[PDB]
Structures are given as structure tokens and as C-alpha cells.
Design an enzyme around this catalytic site. Structure first.
Site, PDB file in Angstrom:
ATOM      1  N   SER A 205       0.871  -1.200   0.000  1.00 54.29           N
ATOM      2  CA  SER A 205       0.000   0.000   0.000  1.00 54.29           C
ATOM      3  C   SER A 205       0.895   1.234   0.000  1.00 54.29           C
ATOM      4  CB  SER A 205      -1.008  -0.102   1.115  1.00 54.29           C
ATOM      5  OG  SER A 205      -2.163   0.679   0.829  1.00 54.29           O
TER       6      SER A 205
ATOM      7  N   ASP B 299      -9.600  -4.846  -5.385  1.00 52.87           N
ATOM      8  CA  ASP B 299      -9.149  -3.960  -4.326  1.00 52.87           C
ATOM      9  C   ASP B 299     -10.208  -2.891  -4.107  1.00 52.87           C
ATOM     10  OD1 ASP B 299      -7.688  -1.982  -2.844  1.00 52.87           O
ATOM     11  OD2 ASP B 299      -5.837  -2.911  -3.587  1.00 52.87           O
TER      12      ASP B 299
ATOM     13  N   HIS C 118      -7.369  -5.921  -0.430  1.00 55.70           N
ATOM     14  CA  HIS C 118      -6.279  -4.953  -0.498  1.00 55.70           C
ATOM     15  C   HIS C 118      -5.062  -5.389   0.318  1.00 55.70           C
ATOM     16  CE1 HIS C 118      -4.176  -1.189  -0.733  1.00 55.70           C
ATOM     17  NE2 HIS C 118      -4.219  -1.038   0.578  1.00 55.70           N
TER      18      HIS C 118
END
Ligand SMILES: [Ca+2]
Ligand SMILES: [Ca+2]
Ligand SMILES: [Ca+2]
Ligand SMILES: [Ca+2]
Length: 243
Positions: free
Chosen positions: A90, A187, A217
Site C-alpha cells: 500500500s 481492491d 487490499h
């Protein structure tokens, strides 16, 4: 107890593991253990204000968190590991790209890394939910949680996050090192097309993109993590290690 950095020492090949916004080292610990089974050293720093009450994030900034990532690279070198791959989840995937421009890495892994600084919707809601869950973890009663959330003001933090992501997107074309881009097709936190942006705009001479159709995610802890770990291992084995 809340998570702390970890340092799993094996062979001379090392991996710097970077977590996401509001995450912590627990999101990459299973990957670290897998890498250890395969003979790789790993170190997972934590960003300032993470693994702590959420107001500490509001008093910090992405500028400091990127320095925390750089400090993690420098800690590996100090501890005797000069050959390092940076792998990030991320926001940590964005920091992995940027770190490669600031320190010598053998390769880069991005995992569900966003491209661009949109924070409305999923990121904003996720941050508020993170804060509410933390206050329940603190043992606070419902009236206290509700009132503290009325006074929780994330706007400046999310603006800084947005600007940091915008800056990194504009730097992607400077990236030169071998790269594996990993993305969950479904996601609900970022635009999965970010992965195509990274793959197509880096200047690396060695690149691969992998899509996962059954993961969310936080791909390093979800239902396909075993395949993700194997794909990372095969990438690492392909690089130009001296030993
Ligand atoms: Ca040592
Ligand atoms: Ca540029
Ligand atoms: Ca080229
Ligand atoms: Ca490759």
C-alpha cells in the site's frame, strides 16, 4: 500488546518490508517468516505514530514516515546487510519506489500500491474506522468513543498523504531497478489500475506484474498470501546477488 518492528536474520540477502498507512509490522510478519524459511533476512520498521493511538498519526506526517523507511534501510546496512530488496504494501509500496531513488536496492516489490493521491471515499472511511476500532481496543465506553470521534480531524493528515502520493507518482519514471508489481484485482481501497501505471511507467529493464483474483487490499494477510509469497521468492531468486 501492540506490534513492534521485527528483524529476522538468516543469510546475507536482505529484504526491507514496508507497511501501509494505519498498518504496522503485523501486516508483513507472515511474509517475513516465509522469507526466513527461504533463507532471506528481513527487517520491518514501523512508521511514527503507527501501532499507537490514532492521534499520534495526526501529530506526525508522511514526511517522517518516509524517513522511517530510509532509516530501516540504513539499519540493515549498519547490521551488516548491504544487498537489499525493498518490498512495500500500500503506501509502503509507494515508499518502496521512492526509496529505490534514494538508496541502492537490488530490486523492488510493490503490493497494492496506489498511484495518485485520492483520499475521498475508501481511504478516509478506513482511517475513521481504524480510529474507532482503536478506541474500543482502549476499553473506552461508547459515549467516550463517539465524542472523541466528533473531535478527530483527519483532513490535514489526508491532505499531506495525498500530496506525498502525487509527488511519488511523478517520480515513477525515474525508477530503474528490477521490479515485481503485485495487485489484487478486487481492491476496494485503491484503484487497481495503479498497478498498470507503475508497470508501464517505471524505467526498469526487468519487470513483471502479477494479478490476484481472490484477494482484498491487504494482500499479504489474505486468502492468496501463499501464492504471493512464492511469487516474491521467485523474483528474489532472479536478482543479481553477490552471494
Ligand atoms: Ca547485529
Ligand atoms: Ca518524472
Ligand atoms: Ca527504457
Ligand atoms: Ca524479472
Amino acid at each position: 500488546k501492540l506490534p513492534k518492528p521485527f528483524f529476522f536474520e538468516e543469510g546475507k540477502r536482505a529484504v526491507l518490508l514496508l507497511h501501509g498507512f494505519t498498518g504496522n509490522s503485523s501486516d508483513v510478519r507472515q511474509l517475513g517468516r516465509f522469507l526466513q524459511k527461504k533463507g532471506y533476512t528481513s527487517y520491518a520498521p514501523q512508521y511514527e505514530g503507527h501501532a499507537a493511538p490514532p492521534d499520534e498519526i495526526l501529530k506526525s506526517s508522511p514526511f517522517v514516515w518516509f524517513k522511517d523507511a530510509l532509516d530501516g534501510y540504513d539499519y540493515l546496512v549498519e547490521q551488516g546487510y548491504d544487498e537489499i530488496v525493498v518490498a512495500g504494501l500500500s503506501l509502503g509500496g509507494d515508499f518502496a519506489l521512492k526509496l529505490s531513488l534514494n538508496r541502492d536496492v537490488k530490486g523492488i516489490v510493490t503490493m497494492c500500491a496506489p498511484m495518485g493521491g485520492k483520499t475521498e471515499g475508501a481511504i478516509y472511511e478506513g482511517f475513521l474506522e481504524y480510529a474507532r476500532n482503536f478506541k474500543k481496543y482502549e476499553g473506552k465506553d461508547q459515549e467516550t468513543i463517539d465524542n472523541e470521534m466528533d473531535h478527530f480531524k483527519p483532513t490535514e493528515t489526508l491532505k499531506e498523504l495525498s500530496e506525498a502520493l502525487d509527488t511519488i507518482k511523478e517520480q515513477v519514471d525515474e525508477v530503474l531497478d528490477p521490479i515485481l508489481v503485485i495487485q489484487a484485482e478486487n481492491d476496494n481501497m485503491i484503484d487497481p489500475q495503479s498497478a498498470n501505471y507503475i508497470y508501464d511507467h517505471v524505467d526498469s529493464d526487468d519487470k513483471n506484474i502479477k494479478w490476484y483474483s481472490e484477494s482484498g487490499h491487504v494482500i499479504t494477510i489474505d486468502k492468496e498470501k501463499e501464492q504471493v509469497f512464492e511469487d516474491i521468492y521467485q523474483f528474489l531468486e532472479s536478482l543479481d546477488w553477490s552471494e
